[PDB]
Amino acid sequence: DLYSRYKKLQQELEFLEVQEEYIKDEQKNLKK
Amino acid sequence: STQNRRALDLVAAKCYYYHARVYEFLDKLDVVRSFLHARLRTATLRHDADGQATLLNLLLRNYLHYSLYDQAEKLVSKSVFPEQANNNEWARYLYYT
Amino acid sequence: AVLQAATGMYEQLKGEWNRKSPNLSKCGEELGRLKLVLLELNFLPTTGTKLTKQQLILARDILEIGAQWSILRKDIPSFERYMAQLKCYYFDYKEQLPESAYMHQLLGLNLLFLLSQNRVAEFHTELERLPAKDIQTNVYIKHPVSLEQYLMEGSYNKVFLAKGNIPAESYTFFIDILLDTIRDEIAGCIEKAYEKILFTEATRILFFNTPKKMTDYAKKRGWVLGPNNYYSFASQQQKPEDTTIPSTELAKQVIEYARQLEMIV
Amino acid sequence: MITSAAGIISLLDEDEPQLKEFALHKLNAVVNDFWAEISESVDKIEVLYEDEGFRSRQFAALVASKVFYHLGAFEESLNYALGAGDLFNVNDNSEYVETIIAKCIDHYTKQCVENADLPEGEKKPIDQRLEGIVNKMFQRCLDDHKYKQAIGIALETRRLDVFEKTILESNDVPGMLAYSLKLCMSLMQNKQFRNKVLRVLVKIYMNLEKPDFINVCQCLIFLDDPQAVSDILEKLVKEDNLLMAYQICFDLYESASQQFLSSVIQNLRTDQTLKMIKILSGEMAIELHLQF
Amino acid sequence: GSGLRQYYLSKIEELQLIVNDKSQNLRRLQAQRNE
Amino acid sequence: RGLAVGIALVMYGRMEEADALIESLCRDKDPILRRSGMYTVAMAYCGSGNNKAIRRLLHVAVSDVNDD
């Protein structure tokens, strides 16, 4: 189950990066 | 050293500070250098910020106890101090540097 | 077996070198072959425990002789190597090894050599290895540190006088290496401090014996001699150049202020 | 003791190879403690490995790797570990050995991933020593009966040979196959390499003692191969295994595109085959669904 | 008798540290955005 | 409005093969064609979890002149 956990962690990291980029964009437009 | 837990590192650093300290009263500080270097490497490879900072401070203190300023200069030149380190360890690192 | 043969072999080198006119080539070959013998007999032991002290002592004496012989033919790398080994045999195994009589002299030689190569940062680090007592007490250590103080503070006359009162004859060679710098340093002051100096006036300043020795050094320095025996050093006209406004740098700094005020969000 | 390696380093620039070899054999005993000062003589300790005529050049590499392993420059560390060769015994339990093994595995994975999508003409040949140590690491999991970890590394390294060998050699072939299929469907995203994994999975499935044709049909739906599914169905009809073929037809209509089923119909045409065309057309499937 | 189990653990913990850091940073950014 | 769904359906489940279309539709001045680009991102990445498409969808969601 080690590989499944490692791949899930990788996907979670990439999803977190996507979420942070979207949050920054939303702040940029929410100011406007 | 046998264990590989994550929170133990937060305890582990303190152990090292006392592990050297007992030898400070033994006035050897030389047998401890190999152990300090090995644990510094094992903490750096593990991204253990607190343990790495404590071990770096202990190694610097050991080097300065014997006026080995060249060795400490090299060690601070190549090693990278953890940015997210304790203030009480940042003070020692800044003093030694 | 090997230890006794190595001791006799070192005795051969000691007898050859202690002669008033040692043979540099023979001593060099002898030292080169002695190193090969030493490799087998735990040369530079790692974490030296209570092993045979005879090997440590023998290696220390051989390295001392080799270091003192490296300056005899006036070469840098051999002295560097022999001093690098001698420091390890001086400070590391000093618990079992006795205090070498020639240790302080050779350490002062190393410090003076570091001064000769302008590696003052290494000079202070190596000086800190000595105890704080013999720095101000032992003559072999007192002379190089005092020379460093004179060089840093600008007492160049004392720097030249340091040749006369050297602690040992071995200190001679490195002294000359320093002296060539001092002259080129002294003139560096003369150009920027003295606006105009007499030709003979620099004789004591530049520490030149022959007036002819002024001419070649001057044309090397490109000093415009004047008709009145005055060297005109008019070169301060190359000021910090406040005539030019560093508008690019100032604009960059102000733009960085604007960034730190606006880019935060 | 030996608080300084300045003398040992000074034993590097001599003209006698014995002096350099002994200095190398003295440094590796203190590379774990005095790597900081040897970091500035890395050039002089690597020039020995550069020279071909040096006896301990491989050793000159190994010690250099150790210094880099202590310096954090893992790329040069693994390069010099490769240069050392047989002296880098992977069976050792030292931290340096396993750290360099991890860095080597990561570098090999990156190179293999880059080469997988690269054209065959531009495929950069991987260093032979890197492949050798990676294969030794694969054999390590094979001997330790850690089949799942080897499967994961094989998937990451895009090496289907080790993937198939680990699947077959494992004691639980069906369980490992199910785990591999779940990993290939849930984690893999390269599609084309996912298709390659499905191809080798189908190869393994066809060679089983009792072929689980259902998983083969599912992987072939994923692969979009009407010819293979039609061939499997027709040999199932010829083999008299009509029940499994009926189940295959129902699964085919349930979870496959209409164009795929139309191509399967064309392949099937080229009694029982009429029933197969009937099920694949689907009309009875909606018959039971509507009746229910 | 473990193979790359230590390698897997090292990779997992290396990703876990970054995941925790990014999760905390994302929570802070989400608080700012929500405000 | 009909063609917006239609163009998306033409490229259903095509993974990155629709990218050349998507960047064309997402950059169009017509709001309905941008909506078609969103639908095409949905159809060409059905259940793939492709975080590139998710990133594009979120960027359009938080920054677009048209509410539709």
From Swiss-Prot, chain A:
Localization in the cell: Cytoplasm; Nucleus
Source superkingdom: Eukaryota
Disulfide bonds: none
Quaternary structure (record): Component of the 19S proteasome regulatory particle complex. The 26S proteasome consists of a 20S core particle (CP) and two 19S regulatory subunits (RP). The regulatory particle is made of a lid composed of 9 subunits, a base containing 6 ATPases including PSMC4 and few additional components. Interacts with NR1I3. Interacts with PAAF1. Interacts with TRIM5. Interacts with ZFAND1.
Family to which the UniProt record says this protein belongs: Belongs to the AAA ATPase family.
Purpose of the protein: Component of the 26S proteasome, a multiprotein complex involved in the ATP-dependent degradation of ubiquitinated proteins. This complex plays a key role in the maintenance of protein homeostasis by removing misfolded or damaged proteins, which could impair cellular functions, and by removing proteins whose functions are no longer required. Therefore, the proteasome participates in numerous cellular processes, including cell cycle progression, apoptosis, or DNA damage repair.
Name listed for the protein in its UniProt record: 26S proteasome regulatory subunit 6B
Organism whose genome encodes this protein: Homo sapiens (Human)
Range within the parent protein: 39 to 70 of 418
Swiss-Prot record, chain C:
Domain PCI: 77-246
Name of the featured protein: 26S proteasome non-ATPase regulatory subunit 8
Modified residues (Phosphoserine): 21
One GO location term (cellular component): proteasome accessory complex
Subunit structure: Component of the 19S proteasome regulatory particle complex. The 26S proteasome consists of a 20S core particle (CP) and two 19S regulatory subunits (RP). The regulatory particle is made of a lid composed of 9 subunits including PSMD8, a base containing 6 ATPases and few additional components. Interacts with DDI2. Interacts with TASOR.
Lineage of the organism: Eukaryota, Metazoa, Chordata, Craniata, Vertebrata
Species of provenance: Homo sapiens (Human)
Similarity-based family: Belongs to the proteasome subunit S14 family.
Residues of the full protein shown: 86 to 350 of 350
Biological processes annotated in GO: proteasome-mediated ubiquitin-dependent protein catabolic process
Phosphoprotein is among the record's keywords: yes
Swiss-Prot record, chain D:
Keyword annotations: Acetylation, Phosphoprotein, Proteasome, Repeat
Disulfide cross-links: none
The keyword Repeat is annotated on this UniProt entry: yes
Residues modified to N-acetylmethionine: 1
GO biological process assignments: proteasome-mediated ubiquitin-dependent protein catabolic process; regulation of protein catabolic process
Entry keyword annotation includes Transmembrane: no
A molecular function GO annotation: ubiquitin protein ligase binding
GO cellular component: azurophil granule lumen; cytosol; extracellular region; membrane; nucleoplasm; nucleus; proteasome accessory complex; proteasome complex
Function: Component of the 26S proteasome, a multiprotein complex involved in the ATP-dependent degradation of ubiquitinated proteins. This complex plays a key role in the maintenance of protein homeostasis by removing misfolded or damaged proteins, which could impair cellular functions, and by removing proteins whose functions are no longer required. Therefore, the proteasome participates in numerous cellular processes, including cell cycle progression, apoptosis, or DNA damage repair.
Similarity remark: Belongs to the proteasome subunit S1 family.
Subunit structure: Component of the 19S proteasome regulatory particle complex. The 26S proteasome consists of a 20S core particle (CP) and two 19S regulatory subunits (RP). The regulatory particle is made of a lid composed of 9 subunits, a base containing 6 ATPases and few additional components including PSMD1. Interacts with ADRM1. Interacts with ZFAND1.
Protein name stated in the entry: 26S proteasome non-ATPase regulatory subunit 1
Curated annotation (Swiss-Prot), chain E:
TM annotation in the entry: none
Domain of life: Eukaryota
Subcellular location field: Cytoplasm; Nucleus
Task of the protein: Component of the 26S proteasome, a multiprotein complex involved in the ATP-dependent degradation of ubiquitinated proteins. This complex plays a key role in the maintenance of protein homeostasis by removing misfolded or damaged proteins, which could impair cellular functions, and by removing proteins whose functions are no longer required. Therefore, the proteasome participates in numerous cellular processes, including cell cycle progression, apoptosis, or DNA damage repair.
Quaternary context: Component of the 19S proteasome regulatory particle complex. The 26S proteasome consists of a 20S core particle (CP) and two 19S regulatory subunits (RP). The regulatory particle is made of a lid composed of 9 subunits, a base containing 6 ATPases including PSMC5 and few additional components. Component of a complex with USP49 and RUVBL1. Interacts with PRPF19. Interacts with TRIM5. Interacts with NDC80. Interacts with PAAF1. Interacts, in vitro, with the thyroid hormone receptor (in a thyroid hormone T3-dependent manner) and with retinoid X receptor (RXR). Interacts with ERCC6.
Sequence similarity: Belongs to the AAA ATPase family.
The protein, known as: 26S proteasome regulatory subunit 8
Organism: Homo sapiens (Human)
Encoding gene, per UniProt annotation: PSMC5
